Swiss-Prot record, chain A:
<comment type="function">
    <text>Substrate-recognition component of a DCX (DDB1-CUL4-X-box) E3 ubiquitin-protein ligase complex of the DesCEND (destruction via C-end degrons) pathway, which recognizes a C-degron located at the extreme C terminus of target proteins, leading to their ubiquitination and degradation. The C-degron recognized by the DesCEND pathway is usually a motif of less than ten residues and can be present in full-length proteins, truncated proteins or proteolytically cleaved forms.</text>
</comment>
<protein>
    <recommendedName>
        <fullName>DDB1- and CUL4-associated factor 12</fullName>
    </recommendedName>
</protein>
<comment type="subunit">
    <text>Component of the DCX(DCAF12) E3 ubiquitin ligase complex, at least composed of CUL4 (CUL4A or CUL4B), DDB1, DCAF12 and RBX1.</text>
</comment>
<comment type="similarity">
    <text>Belongs to the WD repeat DCAF12 family.</text>
</comment>
Curated annotation (Swiss-Prot), chain B:
<dbReference type="GO" id="GO:0160072">
    <property type="term" value="F:ubiquitin ligase complex scaffold activity"/>
</dbReference>
<dbReference type="GO" id="GO:0006511">
    <property type="term" value="P:ubiquitin-dependent protein catabolic process"/>
</dbReference>
<keyword id="KW-0945">Host-virus interaction</keyword>
<keyword id="KW-0238">DNA-binding</keyword>
<dbReference type="GO" id="GO:0071987">
    <property type="term" value="F:WD40-repeat domain binding"/>
</dbReference>
<dbReference type="GO" id="GO:0031464">
    <property type="term" value="C:Cul4A-RING E3 ubiquitin ligase complex"/>
</dbReference>
<keyword id="KW-0225">Disease variant</keyword>
<dbReference type="GO" id="GO:2000242">
    <property type="term" value="P:negative regulation of reproductive process"/>
</dbReference>
<dbReference type="Pfam" id="PF03178">
    <property type="entry name" value="CPSF_A"/>
</dbReference>
């Protein structure tokens, strides 16, 4: 999803 | 015309980079640590790390290597920034002054180039013939190193391979030679080329391209002795050299991906390996010798060593020490030992440095209910996850409270010759002296022999040889421990007062005015000695036996009246050395000599609140430097307290202040108290390790927290926090949280470690039935956290594959209850984007969490605010505005549809909203018309948002994708139907951090407007404030001026740095200000400072006080 992705960009790279 | 001010409140704490080598001296081991735009230099020692130099840069460190070409005394530092600012640094100490000097620099970017896969990669050949760069797909930049090339000119070379994974040069190589895994269709492959720089082209590498695995990602270049290349993938590690090929599949590493490595032994027998898991591996190469033949290689194996924080960065140090740079968590100092203690882990933490790590969400709360905000952040990810409680200042714990409108001094007083405990506090007073005998923890004012009760005491020291002193207006008096009554008494030969009182425990030095006597408390009697008279009235005096003197004290200093001055002088002689000649018509209320480490100290308080500060000499006696602060307007009483091993300097103003120790320097943090008049270390049986502090009226006593401008209190969560609400009435916090689990053999899910959701005190699962239809999964909770104890009171677990993404804590509609609302989302790796989730309304009770109501929705609830007793809530694309039935259910009122995907919203008190994923922000109103949404305006730029905030009715903060901040306001213009549907980007600024959360709040207090704090992926806490156009202006000039004066490092241009920049676009900054840079001013010498002026008025030291009055914005 883009969720695994927002959450990701969340922490960073 | 938008005018904001950005300042760092907390430098980045995350660690992006760390490298080791002899940067400082050819014999010195340095740890270089890269923060983001901070470079820390340390020396490695027995204790660990000697802090040496902390320089900052105007770029994000994207590459950091130390390296050494021929005939170079020691190591040089190569730094590439992320705006392609290359530059070379040298460590340069002018005896006592330290400088990092730019030996070379140039900007290496190319207009051509789409930046690549694995990002920037900069490597340096063993022989130091050059630096190789992979900034772009297809190209490979090469900066040839020479005596010159001081502007790092470089060519590119075209690169057949459009998708390099990782590169290094190989050791033991006639030509420069690169080695790189890269991906095209059929899988990945490992290739080589020489580099002939003579011809700006590539040369068939020493050995055929082979294959490496589907998930190959690191390349290691085994040093000369072995030579070769190591390739790491998932579950597999392999080694290449010519026709050499070893390879292993140790089940142990399959569990998670290797991620960072480090060469332990110079020869390359050993290497560290970092896991996403926090696991530490030893990779060992089994060498092999033949008689007259260079060393081959037999085998390679992996030994699990233990557990560190999730490492970004590993660096082996001295002997079993390992520095462990972490961004997902706290960076740490770590010890490897030959053996494995309990558990079988060869890892042992030595030190832990706090990283606010990823600040992911945060909020402000004045927890004790004062007027200062503390700040509470969800931090870290996975096991490093945590809450961090951040508090400005150094506070103290208040034991008794005796209202005494006077107290004009206090000193300690053991009424028994043995115990460290004093049971008295003889307090100077409004022209009297009351004594304070203690029944332990109980207060009592009684008499005492040979100590006056009608005559104001100026001192009580702790004079040796079994006796107690009292210097009064009149006479230096005397009482014994054996006798205890009348022992002796000094009195001035004229019937004339003592003006300034001094004593340590052996010395006595008074002053009648200019008159400087001297006496001693010799075994039962006060014998006289010296005498001198000075130009002027003695204002104040300090004496203490410092280093190489027990009791009896060496040289000295003093402040007199009319010259407003402080001067250096000896003991029985009183011989004048050097001096200072401070100005103004106000005198030095207090002078003091102290010691901490390796330097003796002189400080001098004046009555204007402000202090001049200097460093003395047990030996010589000269003049240090010169600066001028401004603690509390009122005169400051300097003193020294009992704390730890560097016992420190407490300063009593209207703004009480501790002076601690920085590098070996000295901290200047606030003390969290009303106003302190006088203060002293204490310790009764009833108040140990106490400090005693008189105010306008009150004796108090207590211990003292850390030091740092900031105290940080953490709460280990062991899973990864996501959101955070403070529901006050319930005195707790809501925290969305996320834990990982693995597939079972009964297929279900277990967990990898107890988390904070599994060790909950009580708990819940979602029962609700709203839907129907190894391996990793995420399990989400609402946590309930006690504000006082930081305990997971309750835990609620959501459905299976439901992620909770938003949290509010609000009352809604008529309903007098205060709910915790959590918007959620069902998520499956297949689906591109959830088509379903639910808003859930909960309430927490005496100790209960009840699902008060639910509500399906056909998307992801990315965010929700409390509008006005309504619940406004981004869903997937739609922006919906809910209402609480009196039946107590959420029911739709309206929605806005025009968003690619609404990630964020915020709400200006009135009926106004904002936000979006990719382009950019929309501003909205609610209309108590048909209770519709009217879409007021939007910004028409392609900004991938990450954080959004409303500064005021017109100004909108916004942070994005690419570490820029921007502000928007609505176009006040004619033709109000196009030039009104558009809002212009009036403030532009490259922060250089990725921002997760803004919020209103402030960390200070009980010129600027407002206060919005933000928290970043890196652990930076900044702050944005508004300004007056005039204040903007002064400062904008002051900035431009301030630049010319300031030598940047790497000779990077401040404005190049601050410039708005998304790949496709680069404007310079408008409407923003780094106070970070403004604040630089203070660290400028008065000359370089003068310069900054040449030009309603224009001064020289006004500004040096306009800057002060800002620093206290945080």
């Amino acid at each position: 999803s883009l969720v695994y992705y927002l959450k990701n960009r969340e922490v960073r790279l | 015309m938008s005018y904001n001010y950005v300042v760092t409140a907390q430098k980045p704490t995350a660690v992006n980079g760390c490298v080791t080598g002899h940067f400082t001296s050819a014999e010195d081991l340095n740890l270089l640590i890269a923060k983001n735009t901070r470079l820390e230099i340390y020396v490695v020692t027995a204790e660990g790390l000697r802090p040496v130099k902390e320089v900052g840069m105007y770029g994000k460190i994207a590459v950091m290597e130390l390296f050494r070409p021929k005939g170079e005394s020691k190591d040089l530092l190569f730094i590439l920034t992320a705006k392609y600012n290359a530059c070379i640094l040298e460590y340069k100490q002018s005896g006592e002054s330290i400088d990092i000097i730019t030996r070379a620099h140039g900007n290496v970017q190319d207009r051509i180039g789409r930046p690549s896969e694995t990002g920037i990669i900069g490597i340096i050949d063993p022989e130091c013939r050059m630096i190789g760069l992979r900034l772009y797909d297809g190209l490979f930049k090469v900066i040839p190193l020479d005596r010159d090339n001081k502007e790092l000119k470089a060519f590119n070379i075209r690169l057949e391979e459009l998708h390099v994974i990782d590169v290094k040069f190989l050791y033991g190589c006639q030509a420069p030679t690169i080695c790189f895994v890269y991906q095209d269709p059929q899988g990945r492959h490992v290739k080589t080329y020489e580099v002939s720089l003579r011809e700006k082209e590539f040369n068939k590498g020493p050995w055929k391209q082979e294959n490496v695995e589907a998930e190959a990602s690191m390349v290691i270049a085994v040093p000369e002795p072995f030579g070769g290349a190591i390739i790491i993938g998932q579950e597999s590690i392999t080694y290449h050299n010519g026709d050499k090929y070893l390879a292993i599949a140790p089940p142990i590493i399959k569990q998670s991906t290797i991620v960072c490595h480090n060469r332990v032994d110079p020869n390359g027998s050993r290497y560290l390996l970092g896991d996403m898991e926090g696991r530490l591996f030893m990779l060992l190469l089994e060498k092999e010798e033949q008689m007259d033949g260079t060393v081959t290689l037999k085998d390679l194996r992996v030994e699990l060593l233990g557990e560190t924080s999730i490492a970004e960065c590993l660096t082996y140090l001295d002997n079993g020490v390992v520095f462990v740079g972490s961004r997902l968590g706290d960076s740490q100092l770590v010890k490897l030992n030959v053996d494995s203690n309990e558990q079988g882990s060869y890892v042992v933490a030595m030190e832990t440095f706090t990283n606010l790590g990823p600040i992911v969400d945060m909020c402000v709360v004045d927890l004790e209910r004062q007027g200062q905000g503390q700040l509470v952040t969800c931090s870290g990810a996975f096991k490093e996850g945590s809450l961090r409680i951040i508090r400005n200042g150094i506070g103290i714990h208040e034991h008794a409270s005796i209202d005494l409108p006077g107290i004009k001094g206090l000193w300690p007083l053991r009424s028994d010759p043995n115990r460290e405990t004093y049971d008295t506090l003889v307090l100077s007073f409004v022209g009297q002296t009351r004594v304070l005998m203690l029944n332990g923890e109980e207060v009592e004012e009684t008499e005492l022999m040979g100590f006056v009760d009608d005559q104001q005491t100026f001192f009580c020291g702790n004079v040796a040889h079994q006796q107690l002193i009292q210097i009064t207006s009149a006479s230096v008096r005397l009482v014994s421990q054996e006798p205890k009554a009348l022992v002796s008494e000094w009195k001035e030969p004229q019937a004339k007062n003592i003006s300034v009182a001094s004593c340590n425990s052996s010395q006595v030095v008074v002053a009648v005015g200019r008159a400087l006597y001297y006496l001693q408390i010799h075994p039962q009697e006060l014998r006289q000695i010296s005498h001198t008279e000075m130009e002027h009235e003695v204002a104040c005096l300090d004496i203490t036996p410092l280093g190489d003197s027990n009791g009896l004290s060496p040289l000295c200093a003093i402040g007199l009246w009319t010259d407003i001055s402080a001067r250096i002088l000896k003991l029985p002689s009183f011989e004048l050395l050097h001096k200072e000649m401070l100005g103004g018509e106000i005198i030095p209320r207090s002078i003091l000599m102290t010691t901490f480490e390796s330097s003796h100290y002189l400080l001098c308080a004046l009555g204007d609140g402000a202090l001049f500060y200097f460093g003395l000499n047990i030996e010589t006696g000269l003049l240090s430097d010169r600066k001028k602060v401004t603690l509390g307007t009122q005169p400051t009483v300097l003193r020294t307290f009992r704390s730890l091993s560097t016992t420190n300097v407490f300063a009593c103003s209207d703004r009480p202040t501790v002076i601690y120790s920085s590098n070996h320097k000295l901290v200047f943090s606030n003390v969290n108290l009303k106003e302190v008049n006088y203060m002293c270390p204490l310790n009764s049986d009833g108040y140990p390790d106490s400090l005693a502090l008189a105010n306008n009226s009150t004796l108090t006593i207590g211990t003292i927290d850390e030091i740092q401008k900031l105290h940080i209190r953490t709460v280990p969560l062991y899973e990864s926090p996501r959101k955070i609400c403070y529901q006050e009435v319930s005195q707790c916090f809501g925290v969305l949280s996320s834990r990982i689990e693995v597939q079972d053999t009964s297929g279900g899910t277990t967990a990898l470690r107890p988390s904070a959701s599994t060790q909950a005190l009580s708990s819940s699962v979602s029962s609700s039935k709203l839907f129907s239809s190894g391996e990793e999964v995420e399990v989400h909770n609402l946590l309930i956290i006690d504000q006082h104890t930081f305990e997971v009171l309750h835990a609620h677990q959501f459905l299976q594959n439901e992620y909770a993404l938003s949290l509010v804590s609000c009352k809604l509609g008529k309903d007098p209850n205060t709910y915790f609302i959590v918007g959620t989302a069902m998520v499956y790796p297949e689906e591109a984007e959830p088509k379903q989730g639910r808003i859930v309304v909960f309430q927490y009770s005496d100790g209960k969490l009840q699902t008060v109501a639910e509500k399906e929705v056909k998307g992801a609830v990315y965010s929700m605010v409390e509008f006005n007793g309504k619940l406004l809530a981004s869903i997937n694309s739609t922006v919906r505005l809910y209402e609480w039935t009196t039946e107590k259910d959420v029911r739709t009122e309206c929605n806005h549809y025009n968003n690619i995907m609404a990630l964020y919203l915020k709400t200006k008190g009135d009926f106004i909203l904002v936000g979006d994923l990719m382009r950019s922000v929309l501003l909205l109103a609610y209309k108590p018309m048909e209770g519709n949404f009217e879409e007021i305006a939007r910004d028409f730029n392609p900004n991938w948002m990450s954080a959004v905030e409303i500064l005021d009715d017109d100004n909108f903060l916004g942070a994005e994708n690419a570490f820029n901040l921007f502000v928007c306001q609505k176009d006040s213009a004619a033709t109000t139907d196009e030039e009104r549907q558009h809002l212009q980007e009036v403030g532009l600024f490259h922060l250089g951090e990725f921002v997760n959360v803004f919020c209103h709040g402030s960390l200070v207090m009980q010129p600027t407007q407002g206060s919005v704090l933000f928290g970043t992926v890196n652990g930076m806490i900044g702050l944005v404030t508004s300004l007056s156009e005039s204040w903007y202006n002064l400062l904008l000039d002051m900035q431009n001026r301030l630049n010319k004066v300031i030598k940047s490092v790497g000779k990077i241009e401040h404005s190049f740095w601050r410039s708005f920049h998304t790949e496709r676009k680069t404007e310079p900054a408008t409407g923003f200000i780094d106070g970070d840079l403004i604040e630089s001013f203070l660290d400028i010498s008065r000359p370089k400072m003068q310069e900054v002026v040449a030009n309603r008025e224009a001064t020289a030291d006004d500004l040096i006080k306009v800057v002060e009055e800002l620093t206290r914005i945080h």
